[PDB]
Amino acid sequence: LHYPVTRQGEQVDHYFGQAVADPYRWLEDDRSPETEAWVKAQNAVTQDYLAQIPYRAAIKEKLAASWNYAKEGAPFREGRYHYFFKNDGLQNQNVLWRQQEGKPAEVFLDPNTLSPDGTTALDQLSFSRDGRILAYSLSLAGSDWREIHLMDVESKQPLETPLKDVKFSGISWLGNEGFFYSSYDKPTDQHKVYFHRLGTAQEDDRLVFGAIPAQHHRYVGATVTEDDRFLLISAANSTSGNRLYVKDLSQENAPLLTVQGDLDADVSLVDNKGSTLYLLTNRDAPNRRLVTVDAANPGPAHWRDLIPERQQVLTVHSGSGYLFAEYMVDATARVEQFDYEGKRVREVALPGLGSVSGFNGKHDDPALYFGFENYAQPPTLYRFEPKSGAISLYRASAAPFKPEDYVSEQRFYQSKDGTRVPLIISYRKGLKLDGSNPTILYGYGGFDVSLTPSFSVSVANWLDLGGVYAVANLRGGGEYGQAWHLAGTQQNKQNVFDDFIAAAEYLKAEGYTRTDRLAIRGGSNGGLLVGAVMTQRPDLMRVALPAVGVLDMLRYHTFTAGTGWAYDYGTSADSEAMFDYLKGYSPLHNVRPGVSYPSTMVTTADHNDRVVPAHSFKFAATLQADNAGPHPQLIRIETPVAKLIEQSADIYAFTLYEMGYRELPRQP
Template identity: 25%
Template structure:
């Protein structure tokens, strides 16, 4: 099916950089760990920068033979992508908003055109016929990402929002990759920027109803969003007031608007409980009010909406007002006035009851309907119900009658939302592993699905050439772990194929079915691609997540190895030709799996890998560390957590063994997983490995957690990763 594996030998002139050893003791709970490479954390030290550049030079030399394969994969990605394209316009108020991409340009151009027609008229919500590459009468450019990026080493748009009257456009830009943004405001009537420039803002921007105030989020020195500030347009930025400040270092703060855009919602919380506050944007004198506090230890999200002349609250929550648990969450509603009472006295009405087999992922309301996102049998989908009928049924103790769109695939992902509260349609997105993203408008009154776009895939792509199937691996404790097995239809289960196992398994994040053009380049080379839905993710509900966090975290790693064992025994792969890949917390998964069973893998790519987790979480001054305590436990306070994390954190558990070819890929300006973690890890891997397989570190010097900016650079990054895998597996050539 594919040629025999043949790892390219390291050129004799290429010698891996050897970092000096500077002993740095770390002592906690009576345990002393001497870290020889902690000095690499000094980002401003010229010796550190020189070392990373030497690592890049070594990586380039070792992998030089993969350049033709990288070029081929890049051209395949490019050749399948319609480079001049646009998003489906989305209506908000009196305007249609969309983005364009143009062949040869890295970044989108954000645009709008005027809308017409009554808010309740379905025809008025039919997107205008905007054609890729053709001018649109009346089109206004809000922001040209290419112009913003000109002369900059990096560009990312952090957020953007438009004032209620459509006259002002606020947006934030990152030019370093560190996810810290510069905020500017453009007057769309003149095209000019307002004089104020606000530096060092975080994600989250919202205008007041009258457009005279702008609410934004600020992060502290450890990159934790902790303040909500208010800028009054036309006043000095230095006078911006602090609307809210969160002092608990283990809490994350964010803002959002209610669907009707009347209420500013401030959310504070972590992965186990949360708090919601609200502000009436129609009242310039209003104060921020507490809706549901963290002391109740209820993990929830809230939406405020108007009904029959009164304000109501829609809650998605994991514990009700009487203290009854709902681990997979449920949906309730209550008048806003109820939340002024003590919790035990509040009366919430159940709209969607708890179900052990169905995880409620979210809910929102429009002027006419209730939308509920849910996960069932690993698959995320959406249901709709008329809001008035749902509320009446709930008050009567009955379950509302929901409509759910039907799709013909076993493995897919569907979601929905509305851009405007008054819309008679919901915008529905659909994709699967081999169905390119589709955008529908779902007519709320009738259930009709109107296809607005399927992302084109060029180069003769035929989804029938590929197969996606569900399989199950048996974990060490007997747990059945779901797998998604992807392959080209021509591949046979003859035990000769190269294969890649991919995983994440943290933060209740699910690896949902989604189409990816770059992945086709691996499949077309005969690689069987397996997604391991390990515990710690959210694929099988909240309990699946809880079974892979804190003192049960090792389940994530052993599940991944079990997935590899299933693949090796399935007939779909040659056991000697299996690689693994994961990023961020998935990089921790890769590092842990390599320590557990290095002999099971021929190659590994760890993208921005969280491989020195214990060191990071022990220091609350480092970015996000304190926020991680609800995911991994607090090793500072708890000796059992410390010992447990020490037993699996990849950097501290590298052992003498025959490690496979390893590529650690990182970014110098990453604020989520610092470059120092893979830099240290690579050093100890090289010292410990008993094999001759190359272990390389590739650092993007002008990038952040998501890698280099720009779509072409992203394609090059993916081509690099996949070429490393394909080369190690002997899967360089396309198959029929």
């Protein structure tokens, strides 16, 4: 294996009187002739190395064959039909089907064919209270503009001419009379709420909110409660904070009452019961709380906590006369069922530890549906009986992976300083803890980002090859509260790396794998994680896979988009202490001559605004110049799902090959 020559320049930088050489400074220009030629030469060496891997084509074949599969959503009743979305696996847009009990299912609305070349997309969908009329918004191209169409659902023909010039709008019906929507014009950065009455022309739509000076806002929204009693109007100027107003529709010409008159917090309607409003908000509660207040005097001073804020971020769903609080605890789903009076009915017995969605329904739905998935289980739909709490399988995934063939377990290990850290491990059933299993340990560790379980075909293929997939919930993440995040920032960043090293040691100590059967992986802040751990403990793993990483911690902030990461990392310009700390772990600056590094495959696109290739380019150049051991230090520069399949195949093939496998660990 002969690496392309990478010339070293003479650039030398200085920080607080300290000199730091940057011989690959020229690689920071990803569009210069010399860099683009380097990229081409590196890719040639990498492709040549990968070409010798015997089973690379077989891995790619299985990935491609299992990548696409049919999907179906939960059914919902509107009028005399149950509607549900489906996707055959290749369709660009989901297709809406419907079925009347006692009859066969039929296609109801196929967005793909709304325009030859399928450039017309289905956005909002909203049926009248009786389900006889459907109002839905469509978008053309990558346009923010919308048209609201009105269809008679039985004949499937247009009821009226579509509403035009709609933008950033919801569609909320008031019974079967008409619906509220938002628009900037009549019917200029002044968003307004309008009411369209069925049987009338758009030009006659009543202006509801937003015209007088005190109501001028860039974004407004309107929602009518399911019982048609209240109109809630939200108004905002940006993504942070919104005012909220309520109007009692059961009263003749009721004025708007102020639920929240400032933009200091987010607050939104969950539902009402009688004159009681149920609101989800982050006002004085960053993790959110569910509150109630009487609609006749709805100001924040009167809000009463129904579900007080907790350490975990709250998501609320309502259905069948119950409220459901969803949280991710130790990074996995927990759902609690409450009645509208605040009594906790039960903790819902979810199918296992994973991620969920759903529990959304109408007041009178006899059952609710929820989706569940994790590293070893494809998205599956379950039916939930609200009264009994009974759960049953509604639709198994069409993905070519049977959940019963896999195992997912959560363990907790201790980091160097005693901190207990969560670790989710997945594999094919029948695995033995004899320390021989090829394992990929994945982590991120930063920016309050939580690593929660999610199914991916690529990971599932790894498990079928006989691999173990482990994900550590390191400090710096969002799995707990602010202290957990902060414990992995600025001058505490080392904790993240120590947490990851401890996960690798735990996997070995527990018999899942061993040093020559272990690979570590991560992207972006996760790439930094890999770069840092492989430079501090190059002997801990056999393979290192840093993707799109931030690897030059001394100059990351001077690059495009780097300024936004300053809160988590700090910059070499902050102070001598911050500079010394950053230089202490910066991967680029900690690669050393004579050291034997693990087999490495650095990955990145040839051009990137978020995380510039410069990081990966300079890091790969330095590994190639400094590594003295037998392992290859390669870089794969990306120049559709086709590319994703090729990327995953190269990584798994490279990983197994570097571990010495002549054949797959297990025949999939």
